[PDB]
Design a protein around this ligand. Sequence first.
Ligand SMILES: OC[C@H]1O[C@H](O[C@H]2[C@H](O)[C@@H](O)[C@@H](O[C@H]3[C@H](O)[C@@H](O)[C@@H](O)O[C@@H]3CO)O[C@@H]2CO)[C@H](O)[C@@H](O)[C@@H]1O
Length: 478
Amino acid sequence: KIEEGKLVIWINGDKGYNGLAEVGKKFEKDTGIKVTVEHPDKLEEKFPQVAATGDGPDIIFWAHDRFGGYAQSGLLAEITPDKAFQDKLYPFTWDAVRYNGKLIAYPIAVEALSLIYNKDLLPNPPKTWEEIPALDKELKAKGKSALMFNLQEPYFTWPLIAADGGYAFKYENGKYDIKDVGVDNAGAKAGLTFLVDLIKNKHMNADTDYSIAEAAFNKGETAMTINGPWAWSNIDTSKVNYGVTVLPTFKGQPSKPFVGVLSAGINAASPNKELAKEFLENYLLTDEGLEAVNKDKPLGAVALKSYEEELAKDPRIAATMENAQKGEIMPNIPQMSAFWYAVRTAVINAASGRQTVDEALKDAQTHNFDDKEMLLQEFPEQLTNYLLKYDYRDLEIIKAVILKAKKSFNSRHEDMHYMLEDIEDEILTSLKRLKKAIHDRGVKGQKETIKSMQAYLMQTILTELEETHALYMRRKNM
Ligand SMILES: OC[C@H]1O[C@H](O[C@H]2[C@H](O)[C@@H](O)[C@@H](O[C@H]3[C@H](O)[C@@H](O)[C@@H](O)O[C@@H]3CO)O[C@@H]2CO)[C@H](O)[C@@H](O)[C@@H]1O
């Protein structure tokens, strides 16, 4: 439950949630405010749904890429930290969580995928992806396998795909280009294809998941795996003597892994915005509190300058740093979610016999990424800002309706061809008047959607326009 004067935090299961809870007790002890940290499945999917109802967490913890669609939907509060606190974190990590020149989250850490090898089994880790099959021949004969890592989540197959030149989006002119996607180019084809090649030759099983790969490495069944800093705690427990080095090259070129920044979003809905700023600024982002999270599950290289000095010294952190530089940092555009979904199916269909690599990637490329910016391109910009909240399906509804209501009003009235800009104001108060209606209607226990309430929008737009026209008609008259 979400209530005034209690702080609720959502964080992903593989992160140090026990450690963050530990900071919670340091907060509650000094501030008297309970902190409750839970890690539900699919939180980054659950968040946009219950944020609408207004019963989402106070603080949401995910990699920065997810915070685009959130900031666009206005699910996140604007972060206003004094310049002094800003200087504490890396200027690089501040940029990750910046949307439309607004800071919409607090960067916690920089995480990057790395290669992990078992020093006993493998004297020296491979330098290229292409050496791995010949290892597997030797490895299998010793009853072990060469490489195990999950194929069920694209984050992991991507450093390979991106390697010979695959890319999520072109970047030119300081803006990301949504009509320019590079999932299906020759480069990314060579990548995914290499990976299936491993599946076809039985060097990897297509069905492996994080659970399987983790388990297999900790037990010494496999010699290598690809994972992030949150993986080190569980291996430390294990008997395994591991090593964390740079990702194997593809076709003579570095593995280019996607780099994520762990970020702390505040809920726009929260009563306790002030308690959330206070917690993240004075208790989470200090050395003593970062160390607290870190001891549970390693953060990687943190965003906090001071505590990072001491971390960089760990060859594992500088190794993670090393792959972060050889890779690129995830966009935080709203489409990024639809990108990730679009790929995840493609790898899986590639790994399955579901479809060939070529058709698999084509589809990932073919996909029509939704754009509020594009849908609203005609609309008066002030209106569009209001209109961003609504999900893309509902937007199609309101677009079609608004446009008919205009056409109709022009039909009844010869003398004036109203521009959309002219009607901008009568739409705003109409779209507001609709939000209220769905609430008044929400009481009385009748649940309405914009789809249902399409009739009601239409009439309200017209009624309002007719009022404005009465205003204009009275206005002409002497
Ligand atoms: O299945 C749900 C999910 O698919 C997409 O998730 C991507 C994440 O956005 C992206 O941040 C990255 O997540 C990894 C984290 O960076 C890392 O810290 C660690 O926790 O593992 C995560 C991957 O296992 O990669 C995934 C896709 O692989 C998409 O964003 C979501 O729309 C969607 O909820």
